[PDB]
Amino acid sequence: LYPAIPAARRRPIRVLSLFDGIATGYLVLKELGIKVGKYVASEVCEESIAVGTVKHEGNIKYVNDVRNITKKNIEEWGPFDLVIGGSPCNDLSNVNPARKGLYEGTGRLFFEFYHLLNYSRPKEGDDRPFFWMFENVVAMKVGDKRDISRFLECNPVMIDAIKVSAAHRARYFWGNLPGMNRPVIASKNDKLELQDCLEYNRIAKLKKVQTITTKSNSIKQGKNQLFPVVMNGKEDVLWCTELERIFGFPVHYTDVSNMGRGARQKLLGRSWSVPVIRHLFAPLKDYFACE
Amino acid sequence: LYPAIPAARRRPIRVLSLFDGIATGYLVLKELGIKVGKYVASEVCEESIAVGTVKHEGNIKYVNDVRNITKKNIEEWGPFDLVIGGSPCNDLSNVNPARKGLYEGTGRLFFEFYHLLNYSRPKEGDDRPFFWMFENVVAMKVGDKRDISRFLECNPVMIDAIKVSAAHRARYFWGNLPGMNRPVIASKNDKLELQDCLEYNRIAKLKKVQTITTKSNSIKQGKNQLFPVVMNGKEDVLWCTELERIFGFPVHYTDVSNMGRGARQKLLGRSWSVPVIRHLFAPLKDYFACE
Amino acid sequence: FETVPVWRRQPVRVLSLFEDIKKELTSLGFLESGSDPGQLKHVVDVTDTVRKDVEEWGPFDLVYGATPPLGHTCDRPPSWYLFQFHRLLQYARPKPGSPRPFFWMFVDNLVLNKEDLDVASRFLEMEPVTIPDVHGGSLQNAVRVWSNIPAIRSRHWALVSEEELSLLAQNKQPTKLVKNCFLPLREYFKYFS
Amino acid sequence: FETVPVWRRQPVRVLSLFEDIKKELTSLGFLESGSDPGQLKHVVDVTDTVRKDVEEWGPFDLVYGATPPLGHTCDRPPSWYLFQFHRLLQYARPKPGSPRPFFWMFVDNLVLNKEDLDVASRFLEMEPVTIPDVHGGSLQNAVRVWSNIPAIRSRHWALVSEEELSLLAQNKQPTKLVKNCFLPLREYFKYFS
DNA sequence: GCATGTGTTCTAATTAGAACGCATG
DNA sequence: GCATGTGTTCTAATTAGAACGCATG
Ligand SMILES: Nc1ncnc2c1ncn2[C@@H]1O[C@H](CSCC[C@H](N)C(=O)O)[C@@H](O)[C@H]1O
Ligand SMILES: Nc1ncnc2c1ncn2[C@@H]1O[C@H](CSCC[C@H](N)C(=O)O)[C@@H](O)[C@H]1O
Ligand SMILES: [Mg+2]
Ligand SMILES: [Mg+2]
């Protein structure tokens, strides 16, 4: 365990976010009250970058595709107090029958996180604080989960968003954050039931919904594939504002770039559950400045 | 022209809104501070109704297609202190080369407003106040504007949204509201330039934009058909939240019912300029309760 | 509207528009052959007529409306005759306290379509009654009538099949038809002969 | 890494991964006679090897990485061999202070595609050097080499295009080439003969 | 003197929707 | 002992985009 830091010696946090997506990492850090000194984001999706820049007003330094981040980039942009990221899981999750493992396809991109992490690590003799985290799906081959744990020299903590959200989202979390194995607990403002996430004059058929993916089919629940919502006595799918409240994102967080239903669900379907990440980043406010 | 009413005598306003669209009339009345006793809306578009219901939390009574409203309905739902409506202009606006005029197609829906207005009018010997308003496009056949003025026994005042918004919108306004011919003056919270309506990291090419229709071509300005926005050194069209700010609607007002770019522009394209309507409904504060 | 005794029946003050029925009203005896200047006002283009014009033209006991008979004389859209008729009809209504009987009627010579006819009934608050006006040997005349005359709505006329009379419209390509529907007005006003 | 006086050159301690190089290394005089296990450590499957293993396996002077010789006998993806090689190299590197010289190398037997090659150069922080062995009458030997040996990237090897290297991809099937590749190492360690 | 428009329309992109998949509590 | 899934796919409905239109200050 790293030594406690006096409140006066604390400086703002400097974050390197790989595969940043829609800047969930920056969002939870800001909503925790933590001062964000620098947030270097590696992201290639145009719409994702549009969300991060517009919703956060240019506080995020975007450093496009991760495989073009050199060693010199790390120490120039650094030092980094936090290195987070979640690699694409299209070739790792079991929802894809044509997944290619983590040695082919997009599964290789994990090793870019591994590669850049050891760059960002403080060299020997520097006992300054340094925290990191890596997220991915549970439904991966045991060999993949084995090797990821080997390269990170750490075993993951599984946290399901079912306990803090209205959706099933079971994900592995490697890292060294303080107290990741602690029992997660819900907050007052945690929208725990689908009815809490819906708009006016809409009825929820379930308390909790199945795992949200990029595709529209994951919204129809079960083998029945029933519609999860009823309004005006008519069955309906979830709304973009409702998907946002399910993930714990601010309302209209993805109302950017003239995106429609499918585009906004694609960004949200791959994102992080905000309250899960809030649970993980919460003990960081004892090591960095807050206002 | 209209007898003053003491503050204690004021009672909340009861409004009949025909062709309500996205409930612009209700939004304006509520933002002015006027207590809305009853808002009976006639609208047939599902997405339009979805906006009014969700954004105003069910305070709006939807009735339906205007041609199914009877004289009994007017007396049952009434009495009404205000009757507002904008008839569809697809067969009246000069932008449509195949427009059918006031007497065929959709143009004959104006006579439904005329029909129900006289139903709602206070009978002879009822000194109580009563206001009304009818809006439509300037680009209208001379015979149609003549006949509309004949049936309403009134001549229209033209107000262009350019004086209070960042867009060209010239519309005729029949009615009996207090001081409709008064000079239109801008407010401190009016976004008069397109740059005021854009998101972060977006450059306005123009100070003012051409009239916005339902279609995406009216965003391409002038004969050049140029894009009105530059982002990251790239030409781009307006955004849905930007169109909302251009019109004076609250941001994300049309983030409803999984609507995309085209659907949200269609609703806004037919709508009213909110600051124009605020200029027209403002003298009603001196006739009804306010909180 | 109760019946008025014979010695209190004044002559009619008729507003006729789109069509002159001066010959029909004189024939049945609502109109004196000698009158000055006249008790019947007739306009063909009402696009520029205002309420104070109709108010100026003296109180009206009856307001009559009629579409043009089948032909190429249909200068204007068919619905135009209705909206303008309803517009002028409200101009001719007197104060709420009715001093005398006020009657109105609007006739269509099978020109309006179904979309126009249900718009017609909505604005005139009444479904129309069709006049068969067809002898066993001669099926000549046929009209549609919206009217607040009680007898027009009171008694049973010969029912007809729309499907057969939908084709009667283009077979064209008067008293029993319309003036027989004019007769019951006589009891409320003066009879001249 | 400066040169070492001949009388202070200690025997080399190497770690050979995926391929055993004991025979090729002894031939040039790097390992003394036998029953001394300190000279070499060989592991073929590393999926379960942790840092504590390599740390306790004794400090290493050289870490050798090699891909399978070209043949349809690889359960593993071609990228697997580099990622695992880069994984333990960080485990085998000593403290930041330099007590002795530390070297490493990785050879590819024409198994990695261009995508695996650029990832290889990125992770090993250098573009590779190619080792051709042709005497005109022979086409035989060719490998790609990533290494921190100063003399491995010092002289000017025979520059050959690799449109000619895929022609050498016979795929149906060391002494001169690989020994030449390794010679500059014994100017840093003990000469055994 | 010539650019403008609360739209209809037809065509070219483009996305919606569900079939598909099986190791595993 | 069956139901589940940070996805690929292929087709069938989708919209997107620009042509079209001209009386007119
Ligand atoms: N080569 C690459 N370099 C940088 N980012 C990449 C990349 N390839 C894919 N990505 C991005 O990595 C992201 C992984 S999805 C994870 C999103 C993020 N954790 C969130 O909270 O939203 C995707 O958005 C994808 O666009
Ligand atoms: N028959 C009918 N009955 C009621 N509303 C109708 C109708 N036909 C069309 N409409 C509606 O009339 C509206 C005219 S567009 C006017 C919109 C409104 N003034 C606003 O501020 O947004 C459209 O929304 C259209 O859906
Ligand atoms: Mg852990
Ligand atoms: Mg006026």
Author numbering:
A (entry chain D), B (entry chain A): 563 to 853
C (entry chain B), D (entry chain C): 179 to 351, 360 to 379
Q: Would you copy out the relevant sentences from the publication that reported this structure?
A:
Mammalian DNA methylation patterns are mainly generated by two de novo DNA methyltransferases, DNMT3A and DNMT3B5. The catalytically inactive DNMT3-like protein (DNMT3L) has an important regulatory role in this process by acting as cofactor of DNMT3A or DNMT3B6–8. In addition to CpG methylation, DNMT3A and DNMT3B introduce non-CpG methylation (mainly CpA) in oocytes, embryonic stem (ES) cells, and neural cells. For simplification, we choose the DNMT3B–CGA complex for structural analysis, unless indicated otherwise. Similar to the DNMT3A–DNMT3L complexes, the DNMT3B–DNMT3L–DNA complex reveals a linear heterotetrameric arrangement of DNMT3L–DNMT3B–DNMT3B–DNMT3L.
